[PDB]
Design a protein around this nucleic acid. Structure first.
Ligand SMILES: [Mg+2]
Lengths: 178, 221, 143, 99, 154
RNA sequence: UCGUGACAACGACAAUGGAAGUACCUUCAUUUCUCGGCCAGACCCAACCUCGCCGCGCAAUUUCCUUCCGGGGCUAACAUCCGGUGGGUACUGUGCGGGUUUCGAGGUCAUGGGGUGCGUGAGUGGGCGGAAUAAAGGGUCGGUGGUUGUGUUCUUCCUCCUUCCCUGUCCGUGCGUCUCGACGCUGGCGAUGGAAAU
RNA sequence: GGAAUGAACCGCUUAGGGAUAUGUGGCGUCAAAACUUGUGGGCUCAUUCUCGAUACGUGAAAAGGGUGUUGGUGGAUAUCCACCGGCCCCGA
RNA sequence: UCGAAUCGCCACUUCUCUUAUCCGGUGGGCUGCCCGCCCGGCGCCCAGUACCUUCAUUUUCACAAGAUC
């Protein structure tokens, strides 16, 4: 519900014709805000790989995939982003999340803050739920142990929107103004 | 202020003795300077009378060296041909707060000038403000909801000293005297506070049996 | 279905019913409570008469937009209120014919309130006065 | 940013702070109370002579909420409210009542 | 320093959500600022994600393991009777009282007003007759000073 | 261009100017005075615009859920993870609905009315009158043979009966050439005055 | 109508007026709007022409450096080496 | 002389300090769990929850036609 970038599976093919009857049917996994963007990414991949353009092809399915459950997991996401003066950069990162869509949305925000890369310059190669004992990052492995505990400090507690005072008495909750 | 003979004579005929307008007193200890000024300025424009005390305890984000340099840059500005017409650089903490609030008001219309007239801005808690009533705070600028713990901050009084203010010792001497007098008085009347508390208790078992149940249902007894 | 020409026709809120306690919001009796008795034959104003002993509000007419109908109701099956007719208000010290009508209806209203199981609490309730204190919100209440 | 339009006024009421609370007050009557400098005509000038005074009132109604913090929009009958009322008290009555 | 620790089996109360002022037990921790909350002995409150800025830890704890079954959690809660103890806490009663006032029907509001007035009157009567003997108020203390001052002249 | 008497005020934004109100002045105009072309408030009909509450279709809900094992992992276990076994039968999408044999409310100082009352001042209404009482048009079940498509039988859709379940049917009112005019109920103010109102 | 200001930029193009909704641009105060919205993530500390923050707007910056801090890639060993990014600092 | 706008008040609030902090203080047992100990208020229509008690014709809104100063 919270994450953007839903999980889409796009199935398509080149239109049947002479000199190429019964063309191959391809499958594509993409993470996009809506199915219009999902189909746009599918044809960009088809154009640069199979030399097939959207004008001469058709889409057979634009289904939304379903995830397993609501447990805590480890996700490995290998991603690539383009920039000038550096070309293409490939990396593998690990995240903690609940579903594949959430992990990939985290990765997109992470690349924005740490490397200043926008959505259309980023290509996702794969996402997989890996077990413990084979994650290579300490910022993820520190949540594995049982009996894990920590306190909440430096909290900023804001009141519900209905209460929301402006001036309050020094030694009481009297709410002088508003 | 300073009622002339016209005012005293009119009050004598009419029978009036005293009058006090509705005023809010804000304790400015541990408050972010910019956030408190913005909240107060909007309330002034909405027709409120505000008195702020302890203006020497306002805090500014950053180190004391950084903020002192910022003031020395402001002090450098003056009308070269006639400095007595140029910008005026006030030095007391209470004057600095009023200047900050003034820059957040339309100060060249009669509406803004009237709004600025409704702020007093004392230093410490003077004798004419101690017994007026309970003080208030602004939770949106309390600096324990605003600053991260590890960041250095400046106290306004310390920064106002070292650039020209020469009443820091006077203010701290008067504040310490106020604490002792207020502390002595508050320890007194502990008997009447306890007596009233022992009166609300045992008031139950004297009230009718139905009103106590209603009090229990609403979590008041 | 009821024709608009017929006297029984009326378009008033379902909250305002005979026997309902109401808070008067305007006029010389603002802030007091009274019992709604009936409605005038056409789509006219309601007739409110709180017990004169309790709230000191006599029989008069009021618009439904100047009261707040509370959720506490007193049964009025015993009372008749058939003597209340528009011409008694059309006539425009108190005449004694008005006094006898007010006194007779008041006794029936008082007896009906006493018949209610919470009669003593209701009598004290009708004595109270509504006001807006500094720091309360009438829009968050439930009535 | 281009200037003001004086046929509508903005009123801030105590203890609303929410759009849902401001929607309770749509349609309610509003008045602004001030005084003149002599006794002019008033309602019930002949039936209730005790009412005669320098006090005067300008009435209006609440049309719709403004923003998300509980401010409302008010139209003052045909004319507009004077600009000397900015920052002063406004009365918000409880009638007409839907409750 | 004295904070209650965030861990599996710790009861929390929700601050500002749709399920405001509700209690559930933490069952797992995912990253720094997200947990899974569940309470099987109350309507709604199935397993769901909750931000750590929207909960407050309580003093009560239940011995369970991370990612435990719903039937295992239900058994653990009833054995320790933790939910009943929270209901007896003063913080819970204050919250329950505020909800009761929001539902009031202007007749119970009058009844509460009568009850408070009755207590205030009796407190005033109790405070006096403890001021006649062992005076404590401002006026009763000054009466002794006045009487002794007038003894010599009168 | 200047003097004088009366008055209005006014800090310093040079004045002048525009818009919208207000406070005092009016040798101005129009209306009313026992009905009013004055000021308010509520109500009705039509129209337009909103909010609550309740729902539907689609393989969208199976790249999924649950049990019993073999790996693997932690700690004694469980869990995250990978292969198999038998059961399956609030949920991250998309297109839409709901007042008249009645689904609950709100607003128009942002609209027109004679506000059903006289005559040609044309209530058109599933809404106003008269009649009649499931009227044709849908949702499931069980059978019934033609059809689309996988795979070497079952899967859709049709037409034809059988069970229950839901809803709402028919009729009716042109003017003797054309146009404009007609402003209900309640209170305040106004009874000829250096009067009210615009 | 917006970009504080500007012939030419952004939006839109113009009879006299109401109601509703938008565009560009915005919602700490000046100044209408989050009375300082989120029950969303990260990164950053900037001492003397004073860190940064609306395009056109060279309406001001380069080569070259810094484990200051936060991320990646490729090799040895159960920490070391080489290289490349983000924000900040020197060059100024 | 003045007709005016404003509509809570208190000798229980009117002392101080912290927010990585026993949020009322405060000890003990085995680096987080468990176990003990002691101590804002009034105000809204009988001076008070109880019997009794004048409200009008100001007969449908209008600055509260009433108060404070
Ligand atoms: Mg604003």
């Amino acid at each position: 519900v919270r994450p953007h970038l839903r999980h889409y599976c796009v199935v398509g093919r080149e239109t049947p014709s002479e000199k190429n009857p019964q063309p191959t049917v391809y499958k594509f996994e993409v993470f996009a805000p809506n199915f219009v963007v999902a189909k746009s990414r599918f044809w960009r991949m088809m154009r640069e790989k199979n030399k097939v353009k959207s004008t001469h092809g058709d889409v057979l399915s634009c289904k939304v995939v379903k995830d397993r459950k609501l447990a805590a997991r480890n996700y490995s996401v290998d991603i690539a982003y383009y920039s000038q003066r550096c070309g293409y950069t490939h990396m593998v990162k690990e995240f903690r999340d609940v579903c594949k869509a959430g992990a990939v949305s985290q990765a997109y925000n992470d690349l924005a803050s740490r490397h200043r890369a926008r959505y259309h310059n980023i290509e996702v190669l794969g996402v997989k739920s890996i077990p413990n004992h084979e994650v290579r990052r300490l910022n993820v492995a520190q949540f594995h142990p049982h009996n894990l505990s920590f306190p909440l400090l430096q909290r900023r507690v804001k009141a519900p929107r209905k209460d929301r005072v402006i001036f309050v008495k020094k030694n009481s909750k009297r709410a002088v103004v508003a | 202020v300073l009622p002339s003979r016209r005012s005293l004579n009119r009050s004598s005929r009419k029978g009036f003795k005293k009058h006090r307008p509705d005023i809010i007193v804000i304790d400015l200890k541990d408050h972010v300077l910019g956030r408190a000024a913005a909240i107060v300025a909007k309330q002034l424009l909405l027709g409120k009378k505000i008195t702020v005390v302890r203006c020497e305890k306002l805090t500014i984000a950053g180190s004391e060296i950084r903020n002192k340099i910022k003031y020395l840059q402001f002090l450098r500005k003056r009308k070269l041909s006639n400095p007595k017409l140029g910008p005026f650089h006030h030095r007391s903490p209470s004057d600095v707060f009023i200047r900050t609030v003034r820059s957040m008001l339309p100060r060249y219309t009669k509406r803004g000038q009237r709004a600025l007239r409704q702020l007093v801005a004392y230093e410490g808690v003077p004798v004419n403000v101690v017994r007026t009533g309970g003080r208030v705070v602004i939770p949106k600028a309390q600096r324990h909801n605003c600053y991260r713990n590890e960041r250095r901050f400046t106290v306004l009084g310390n920064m106002c000293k070292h650039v020209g203010w020469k009443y820091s010792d006077v203010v701290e001497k008067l504040e310490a005297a106020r604490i002792e007098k207020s502390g002595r008085h508050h320890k007194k009347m502990e008997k009447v506070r306890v007596a009233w508390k022992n009166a609300r208790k045992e008031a139950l078992k004297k009230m009718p049996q139905k009103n106590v149940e209603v009090l229990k249902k609403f979590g008041l007894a | 279905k009821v024709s608009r020409k017929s006297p029984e026709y009326s378009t008033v809120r379902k909250s305002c019913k005979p026997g309902t306690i109401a808070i008067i919001l305007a006029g010389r009796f603002r802030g007091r409570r009274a019992v709604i008795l009936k409605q005038l034959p056409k789509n006219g104003p309601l007739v409110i008469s709180g017990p004169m002993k309790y709230s000191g509000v006599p029989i008069r007419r009021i618009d439904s937009r100047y009261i707040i109908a509370t959720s506490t109701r007193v049964d009025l099956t015993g009372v008749d209120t058939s003597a209340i007719t528009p011409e008694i208000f059309k006539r425009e010290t108190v005449s004694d014919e008005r006094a006898q009508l007010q006194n007779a209806i008041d006794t029936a209203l008082i007896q009906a309130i006493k018949k209610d199981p919470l009669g003593k609490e209701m009598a004290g309730y009708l004595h109270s006065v509504f006001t807006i204190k500094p720091g309360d919100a009438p829009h968050r209440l439930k009535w | 940013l281009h200037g003001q339009n004086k046929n509508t006024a903005l009123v801030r009421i105590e203890n609303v702070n929410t759009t849902e609370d401001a929607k309770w007050y749509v349609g309610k009557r509003v008045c602004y109370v001030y005084h003149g400098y002599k006794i002019k005509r008033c309602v019930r000038w002949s039936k209730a002579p005790a009412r005669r005074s320098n006090t005067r009132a300008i009435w209006g109604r609440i049309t719709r909420p403004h923003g998300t913090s509980g401010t409302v929009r008010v139209k003052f009958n045909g004319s507009s409210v004077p600009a000397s009322a900015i920052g002063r008290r406004i009365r918000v009555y409880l009638y007409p009542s839907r409750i | 320093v004295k904070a209650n620790y965030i861990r599996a089996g710790r009861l929390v109360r929700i601050l500002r959500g749709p399920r405001q002022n509700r209690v559930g037990v933490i069952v797992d921790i995912v990253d720094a600022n997200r947990v899974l909350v569940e309470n099987p002995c109350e309507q709604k409150m199935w397993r769901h994600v909750q931000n750590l800025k929207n909960v407050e830890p309580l003093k009560f704890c239940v011995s369970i393991s991370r990612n435990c079954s719903t039937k295992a959690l239900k058994e653990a809660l009833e054995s320790k009777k933790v939910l009943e103890k929270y209901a007896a806490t003063k913080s819970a009663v204050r919250i329950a009282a505020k909800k009761a006032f929001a539902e009031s029907t202007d007749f119970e509001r009058y009844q509460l007003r009568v009850a408070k007035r009755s207590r205030a009157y009796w407190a005033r009567k109790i405070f006096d007759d403890n001021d006649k003997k062992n005076p404590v108020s401002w006026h009763k203390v000054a009466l002794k000073k006045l009487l002794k001052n007038a003894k010599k002249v009168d």
